[PDB]
Amino acid sequence: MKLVTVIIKPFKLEDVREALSSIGIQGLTVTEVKGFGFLPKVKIDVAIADDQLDEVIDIVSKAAYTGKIGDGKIFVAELQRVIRIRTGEADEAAL
Amino acid sequence: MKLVTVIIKPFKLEDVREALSSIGIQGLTVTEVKGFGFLPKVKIDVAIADDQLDEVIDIVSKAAYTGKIGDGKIFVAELQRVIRIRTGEADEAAL
C-alpha cells in the first residue's frame, strides 16, 4: 500500500480530481495549506494499492503540468495498513 | 513507533477523543479537512509506541462505529523517530 501526496495551486484541484476519477480513484482527502515556495495551496492525499503507483503519479503529473514554475510536487510514503471502520476490511479491501 | 491517522465525520470528534483518553492517550493533532467520499471531515493523527497499535485501532473503531456508510477509515504508517523539543527525549520517552 502507498500514500501518495500531491501539493499544488488551489486552482488545479478540479483537474487533478477529475484525472483521478479517470482511473477509478474517488477516495481522497484535501487540506487547505500554505506553501513557502507563503501562498495558499491544496494538499491532496491518496492511499492506493502498490499496483497503482506508477498509474497514479502519471495521471496526476499530466493533470497538473504546465511547464511553468509552480506545477507542484509528489510525495510517496509506505502505508503499513488501512482499515475501513464500518466493515473491518483491511488494506486493498479498505479502499 | 507508529503514526495512526483516523479520518471521520466532524461530529464524532468527541467520541474518539474520549475513547482515546480511556487508554491514557491525550496527545493528538486534529486537522479540519475535506473528504471526497466533497464534505467537511476531521483528521486525527496520533503517534504511539508499537505495543499500543492493536489497542488503539480497537478503541477508535468502536468509538466511531455505527454500521452505516461513512464511519471513517484508519491509516497506519511507521514513525522512524519522535523528539520532545523541550527535553530532547526520543521515541517512547517523547510521548
Ligand SMILES: Nc1ncnc2c1ncn2[C@@H]1O[C@H](COP(=O)(O)OP(=O)(O)OP(=O)(O)O)[C@@H](O)[C@H]1O
Ligand atoms: N521540500 C519540501 N518540503 C515540504 N513541502 C514542500 C517541499 N517542496 C515543496 N513543498 C510543498 O509543495 C508545494 C508545491 O511546490 P512547487 O512545485 O510550487 O515548488 P517550486 O519550487 O515553487 O516550483 P517547482 O516545483 O516547479 O520547481 C509548495 O508550495 C510546498 O507547499
Ligand SMILES: Nc1ncnc2c1ncn2[C@@H]1O[C@H](COP(=O)(O)OP(=O)(O)OP(=O)(O)O)[C@@H](O)[C@H]1O
Ligand atoms: N483511499 C483514500 N485515500 C485518501 N483519503 C481517503 C481514502 N479513502 C477515504 N479517505 C478519507 O477518509 C474519509 C472517511 O472515509 P469514509 O469512511 O467516509 O468513506 P466511504 O467510502 O464514504 O465509506 P466507508 O468507509 O464506510 O465505505 C474520507 O472522507 C476521506 O477524507
